[PDB]
Amino acid sequence: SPSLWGDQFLSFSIDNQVAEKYAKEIEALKEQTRNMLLATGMKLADTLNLIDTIERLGISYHFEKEIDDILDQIYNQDLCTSALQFRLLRQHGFNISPEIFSKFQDENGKFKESLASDVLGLLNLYEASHVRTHADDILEDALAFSTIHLESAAPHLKSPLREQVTHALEQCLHKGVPRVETRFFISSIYDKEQSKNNVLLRFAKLDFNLLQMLHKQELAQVSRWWKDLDFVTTLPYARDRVVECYFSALGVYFEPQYSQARVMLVKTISMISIVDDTFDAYGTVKELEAYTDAIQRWDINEIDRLPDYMKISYKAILDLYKDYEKELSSAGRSHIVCHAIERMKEVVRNYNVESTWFIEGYTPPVSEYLSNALATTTYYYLATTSYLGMKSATEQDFEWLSKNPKILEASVIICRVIDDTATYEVEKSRGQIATGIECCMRDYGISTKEAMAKFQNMAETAWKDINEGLLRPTPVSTEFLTPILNLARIVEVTYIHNLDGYTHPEEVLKPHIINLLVDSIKI
Numbered sequence: 001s002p003s004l005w006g007d008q009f010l011s012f013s014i015d016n017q018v019a020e021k022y023a024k025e026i027e028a029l030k031e032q033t034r035n036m037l038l039a040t041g042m043k044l045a046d047t048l049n050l051i052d053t054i055e056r057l058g059i060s061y062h063f064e065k066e067i068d069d070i071l072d073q074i075y076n077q078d079l080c081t082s083a084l085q086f087r088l089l090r091q092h093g094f095n096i097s098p099e100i101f102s103k104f105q106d107e108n109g110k111f112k113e114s115l116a117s118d119v120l121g122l123l124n125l126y127e128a129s130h131v132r133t134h135a136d137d138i139l140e141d142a143l144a145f146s147t148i149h150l151e152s153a154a155p156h157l158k159s160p161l162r163e164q165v166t167h168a169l170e171q172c173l174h175k176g177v178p179r180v181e182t183r184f185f186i187s188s189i190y191d192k193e194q195s196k197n198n199v200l201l202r203f204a205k206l207d208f209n210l211l212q213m214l215h216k217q218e219l220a221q222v223s224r225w226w227k228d229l230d231f232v233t234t235l236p237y238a239r240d241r242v243v244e245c246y247f248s249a250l251g252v253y254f255e256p257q258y259s260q261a262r263v264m265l266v267k268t269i270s271m272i273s274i275v276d277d278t279f280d281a282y283g284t285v286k287e288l289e290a291y292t293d294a295i296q297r298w299d300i301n302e303i304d305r306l307p308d309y310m311k312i313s314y315k316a317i318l319d320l321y322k323d324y325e326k327e328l329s330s331a332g333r334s335h336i337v338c339h340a341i342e343r344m345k346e347v348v349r350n351y352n353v354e355s356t357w358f359i360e361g362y363t364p365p366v367s368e369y370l371s372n373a374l375a376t377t378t379y380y381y382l383a384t385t386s387y388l389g390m391k392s393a394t395e396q397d398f399e400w401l402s403k404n405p406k407i408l409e410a411s412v413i414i415c416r417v418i419d420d421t422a423t424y425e426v427e428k429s430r431g432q433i434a435t436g437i438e439c440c441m442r443d444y445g446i447s448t449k450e451a452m453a454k455f456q457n458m459a460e461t462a463w464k465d466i467n468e469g470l471l472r473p474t475p476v477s478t479e480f481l482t483p484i485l486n487l488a489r490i491v492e493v494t495y496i497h498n499l500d501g502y503t504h505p506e507e508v509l510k511p512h513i514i515n516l517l518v519d520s521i522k523i
């Protein structure tokens, strides 16, 4: 499919006038909200609720500290309140004990079925059940419990609750994309809340709409940068998904301070997409081998062994990193670009092996499979690329990333296992007997069902691992853990109808793209 979008995102003339109007009133709403947080005699359930709402609306990135000091204090000092308190502290790194859920369970470890009539309690427990780590076996039955009752109780709930419950049973807050969920909360829920806080709603719509202007600009910038390359008329075999790449970079981070980073990350994602397309639906055994080698060396002098068409990809790639080296200059962080590069070569290496395995009809043992198939997700790559733009990222931080941290390793597994479950049958048809599930089935001598079932558990384990990763002390500043977390969210979001949303956007991403980069939240 050619691009659903077309030249539509190419032009964007911001109404500075409008943007200024929005900015000014927002600053005034910022302070009003700030003072809401600083209120002295508030109850626990009112404070936890306040913070929950500000976060969901997507304006919590303004009061990053105010909210931290409040949770810290709440950490150093009913089901609904408990689970919420749990989730919020945990998402922030505070390792609060699960024995809070003790007083809600029987002597036999399970939850009292007498709670089945507490919807708000069941709901917040459901959301909290997704941020559990391996040491939280107390919450082993939290999800199936709250789910079954939520489903049963939802059809007769008043709105918007009913709509909030039905949506959560399809997508939990923790594992969803921030912008996407915020767009859902503001318009479909909080705006329709009878007790909604007018100041916070107003604040929430302006802000979301204002940052949408910036994203619209960014995407424009990237849409012109993508036409001046003409891989649309030059390299027809490749996928034109620059908008979808932007959604991915927007999923990694949306704050305005990451404007430089996002644009950097979009160019990479788009770029590497081409290379997979080359190795997959185009280049030949020899051509690919010549391409992988070319990449590994890295010096334009080689654009020669490469066929004419691979010459274009290769040059574009090298110039992109030269641009990167150039953008950074001002700060003096050009010496970190290499980090992204060594990862890219790693992706290219495996891409090659992947093909080699396809020609020989090799069906590796799962062990050997992942050792190679993990990087081909490009997740170490994007993770490493996401830092480039972050003005705070140091060498000592990339060094952390280069050792393949457990949080990153788990983010990558989630992207691998889910992708292999969602694209088994298709990839198979094409003769690729090297696909996850296959190696799994033959390796463990199990059915397709059992193989997928075992891959799911890998993902669950992975999540439990990512949740631990967020706990303090954090190996690096939380600021650099979130990009990894979000990447995993993006996987969970893109393959929900259990299907490639980036290779088949229409049913999954299109909507998000429309609600995030097209339609503004009507005030």
Ligand SMILES: CC(C)=CCC/C(C)=C/CC/C(C)=C/[C@H](O)P(=O)(O)O
Binding pocket: 248, 269, 272, 273, 276, 277, 376, 377, 378, 415, 419, 490, 491, 494, 502, 503
């Ligand atoms: C689902 C997610 C988050 C996708 C991230 C995007 C990425 C850089 C795409 C490049 C090309 C891909 C991925 C092809 C196949 O899908 P494959 O890799 O399966 O051969």
Ligand SMILES: [Mg+2]
Binding pocket: 276, 279, 280, 351, 354
């Ligand atoms: Mg490939």
Ligand SMILES: [Mg+2]
Binding pocket: 419, 420, 423, 427
């Ligand atoms: Mg796949």
